[PDB]
Amino acid sequence: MILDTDYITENGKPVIRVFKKENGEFKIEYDRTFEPYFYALLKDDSAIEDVKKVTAKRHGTVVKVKRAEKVQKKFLGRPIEVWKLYFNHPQDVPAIRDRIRAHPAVVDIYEYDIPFAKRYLIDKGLIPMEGDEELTMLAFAIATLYHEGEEFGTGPILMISYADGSEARVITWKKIDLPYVDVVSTEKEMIKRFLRVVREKDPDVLITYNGDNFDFAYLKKRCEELGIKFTLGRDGSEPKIQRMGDRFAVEVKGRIHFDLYPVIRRTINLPTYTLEAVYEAVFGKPKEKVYAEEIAQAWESGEGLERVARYSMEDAKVTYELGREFFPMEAQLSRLIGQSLWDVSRSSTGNLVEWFLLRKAYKRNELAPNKPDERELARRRGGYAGGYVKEPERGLWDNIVYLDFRSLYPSIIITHNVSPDTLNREGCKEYDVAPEVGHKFCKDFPGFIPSLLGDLLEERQKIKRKMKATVDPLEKKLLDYRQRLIKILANSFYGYYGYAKARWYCKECAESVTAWGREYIEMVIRELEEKFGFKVLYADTDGLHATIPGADAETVKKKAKEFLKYINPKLPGLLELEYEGFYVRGFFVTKKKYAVIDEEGKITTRGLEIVRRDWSEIAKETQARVLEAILKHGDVEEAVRIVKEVTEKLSKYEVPPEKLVIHEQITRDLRDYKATGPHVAVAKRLAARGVKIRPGTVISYIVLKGSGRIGDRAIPADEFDPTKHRYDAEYYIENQVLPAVERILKAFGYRKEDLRY
DNA sequence: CGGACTGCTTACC
DNA sequence: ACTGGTAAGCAGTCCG
Ligand SMILES: [Ca+2]
Ligand SMILES: [Ca+2]
């Protein structure tokens, strides 16, 4: 299997490395045969020498076009011949481009921003993570003596924990008499050991939890301030601290640094993303968090260091088990997208999509359109019509069928050949005119995106067939990841169309996909209500909830199945309606907010404060019970009673504080904020004390007793002390518990005043 | 000024 | 930073 690619500068020339593992051994295949390239379009072909006259001033010597050649390519299908200007070293590519472009002879520059290492893998047609090879992994984690708003590295590392299949051990420089602890002389000695342990083990993968933005950055500052060759790489290299927008990433050249945080953060929805949280969320088992006030008092005292050690070890053990679970599927994405596990795991859907296109575009001899200019991005800042959302028939209904189109937007993109290279073509024999947007789509040649989207779905069925066959549960797991990911990559293409930063941006394409969506869902609802006696209780983009009011469950089901048999043949191309749920009873509140309970008793909840992570657990828990009380059981009184108890408990300060915690994400740079919420207020106060409240940070806080602004009474959850200051029973009554409960109970002719204690 | 409007902000579907 | 459509609350805005 191939791990990743980079290049070293062997005596002026660049040498491409292909880090791999085959025959149970790690190899480094070098390659000096590859040369950088970049496409240019001149107005008059003859004057290629005049353009080649353009040199570029670089920090290291001078640079000029090593060679050139006319390449017969295509651009949005329409053939286009271009000058492919080669270069001696790739670092000269970004120097001589702003000049080579600006030149009045050259029309435009194309494919100038693709990294050399990644470019090689695209052209050679090599696929990271292929073929069954067992990769050894090693998890590691650190415990530091943190104080309030110190400089990052000022505190020394007390412990370093590591974990793998065989064991989990702790390296520290204070006497802790436990079998899994290794006591060194000093902090410098603890690290010097940890570095041996890695080397002696020689693992392919290094697993961390937020290792990119903390653990690796911290160890460097320590190793720097102590004078240590922090050499973790197989080539004996120090870790690279490369930047990635608001955050950084960390490269261990020779090994795969797998940081779980960006994966976990982008895969599971949780209020907090503490390692203690995700372990419970993924595995079910609990995990104790030994805090900094504890860690410090232990170090300073020497008293309870055995407890601080159990934490250090667990942190690693957990970190390893999370890695061993998530790494498999992230490896399948490495193969699918065509770039490294390192890149893939740190990338957005926009990038993973764009990397998929660049690869399939090369194979197809399609010249990749450039990322948008600062001016261009603002030129394409115009929103469009989205999905249809029917205003719900509010109330408590019985016997609901839920119908929805199988993969709507991708089915529309393939069926109507919605591509940027099929949009308003010159003299196609056959054309598809989109309903409201009016944009015509050519039907003579399969479009670039539709074609690939076709192949993806084509393959997803090949993989789901090989699954039913595959006897090995290990293969049946790895096959499932492949097809589950393909489906996500498939439904991502419409969004990539509407994405201003995207290479293959197409406002017309996006607007037309949604436009058809509306045509079809509305025509189903119309047929379902007219041709058949159904009442559509609710709908949203591609699905609907319906019933025959008086009818029984058996009848609803039959007549619903009858409808599919009727409608589906009248629908065009890949568009096909599906029966995907029956519910004994259902409760629709507002657009986006509703709950159902199936024949077997499982309540499904959508939109309501229960599922929202910016609501106190008591409000959510309260709503959840005052919702079960009306659905699972038909006792509207029970809900009245439940609400009346949860109020008095809050009134008599008997509700545990943990349940009163309110989580809100800080989205942008704190200074940029216009208006101040309670969660911004807390962030601005913590910023004065030098807490790292950066974009992506979650503000956990409790509202304290008083009056005026809710934000000026807001303190961090960590810093709540029952003895010192109490909580605001008025807030968690009037602003949380009562509202969420009244949403459900308002339909049963109850007032808010009624439910209070 | 004690109410109703309106804009900012977050997280959901 | 993959989209648009939507609920809902905080904390200011207007106005008689
Ligand atoms: Ca549903
Ligand atoms: Ca579906």
Tell me the domain boundaries of chain A: 1-130+348-368, 131-347, 369-446+500-585, 447-499, 586-757
Closest nt by CA–C1' to A592: B13
> How many CA within 13 A on the CB side of residue A72?
0
Cα–Cα distance between A305 and A302 in angstroms, integer? 6
CATH says A1-130+348-368 is which class? Answer: alpha beta
- B7 closest protein residue (CA to C1'): A675
Q: From edge to edge, which strands make up the β-sheet containing A593-598?
A: A389-390, A535-540, A543-547, A395-405, A577-590, A593-598, A603-606
C-alpha angle with apex A97: A92 to A101, nearest 5 degrees? 160
Residue keyed to tokens 């299908």: A77
* Amino acid at the residue A508: E
Tell how far the Cα of A418 is from the centroid of ligand 2, in angstroms.
20
Which CATH entry fits the domain spanning A131-347: 1.20.120.160, 3.50.50.60, 3.30.160.20, 3.30.420.10? 3.30.420.10
Distance A405 CA to ligand 2 centre (A): 5
Q: Which CATH code fits A369-446+500-585?
A: 3.90.1600.10
Determine the protein residue whose CA lies at the shortest distance from the C1' of C12: A675
Structure tokens at A131: 């073929």
| Cα angle A243, A244, A246; round to 5 | 100
A677 CB and strand B closer than 7 A? yes
A390 Cβ contacts chain B strand, under 7 Å: no
Q: Please count the helices (runs of H) and the strands (runs of E) in chain A.
A: 24, 29
- In sequence order, which ranges of A59-172 are alpha helices (DSSP H)? 97-102, 116-124
Residue whose pair of structure tokens reads 């595959």 in the numeric block: A470
CA of A539, nearest ligand number = 1
Among residues A573, A639, A610, which one has the least CA distance to residue A736? A610
Ligand nearest to the CA of A407: 2
CA distance A506 to A493: 11
How many Å does it take to go from CA A716 to C1' C12? Answer: 24
Nearest protein residue by Cα to C1' of nucleotide B9: A677
Residue A523 is encoded by which pair of tokens? 């025509």
Q: Assign A80 to helix, strand or coil.
A: strand
Q: Name the residue with the least CA to C1' distance from nucleotide B11.
A: A612
Q: Within 10 Å of residue A530's Cβ, how many Cβ atoms?
A: 9
Per-chain residues with Cβ under 5 A from ion ligand 2: A 404
CA distances from A139 to A202, A216, A291, A325 (A): 12, 13, 21, 13
**CA gap A76, A79 in Å, rounded:** 8
Spatial separation of the C-alpha atoms in residues A702 and A687, rounded to whole Å = 18
A607 CA → B12 C1’, Å: 6
Long-range contacts of A91-97 (CB under 8 A, 24+ apart): A91/A58, A91/A60, A92/A36, A92/A56, A92/A58, A92/A63, A93/A36, A93/A38, A95/A56, A95/A57, A95/A58, A95/A63, A96/A54, A96/A55, A96/A56, A96/A63, A96/A64, A96/A65, A97/A38
A548: left (phi over 0), alpha (psi -120 to 50) or beta: beta
H-type alpha helices, A416-506: 448-469, 473-491, 493-497
State the ligand closest to the CA atom of A542: 2
Cα separation, A357 vs A335, in Å, equals: 14
Which nucleotide's C1' atom has the smallest distance to the CA of A351?
Answer: C2
Q: Do A203 and A255 contact (CB within 8 A), yes or no? A: yes
What 8-state DSSP symbol labels residue A371?
P
Q: Please state the separation of Cα A581 from the chain's center in Å.
A: 28
Q: Which nucleotides of C are covered by protein (CB under 7 A)?
A: 1-12
Q: Which nucleotide is nearest to A384 (CA to C1')?
A: C4
Helix axes A275-283, A305-337, angle to 10 degrees: 60
CA distances from A709 to A384, A683, A703, A704 (A): 38, 16, 10, 11
Which two three-digit tokens encode residue A377? 């991005």
Q: Which nucleotide is nearest to A665 (CA to C1')?
A: B10
Way the structure was solved: X-ray
CA distance A208 to A326: 12
Q: What is the DSSP letter of A423?
A: B
Confirm whether any atom of chain B, the nucleic acid strand, is less than 7 Å from CB of A607: yes
Q: Who contacts A287 (Cβ-Cβ below 8 Å, separation ≥6)?
A: A275, A276, A279, A280, A314, A318
The Å distance, CA of A402 to C1' of B5, is 39
Could you please state the CATH topology (level 3) that the domain comprising A447-499 is classified under.
Answer: Helix Hairpins (1.10.287)
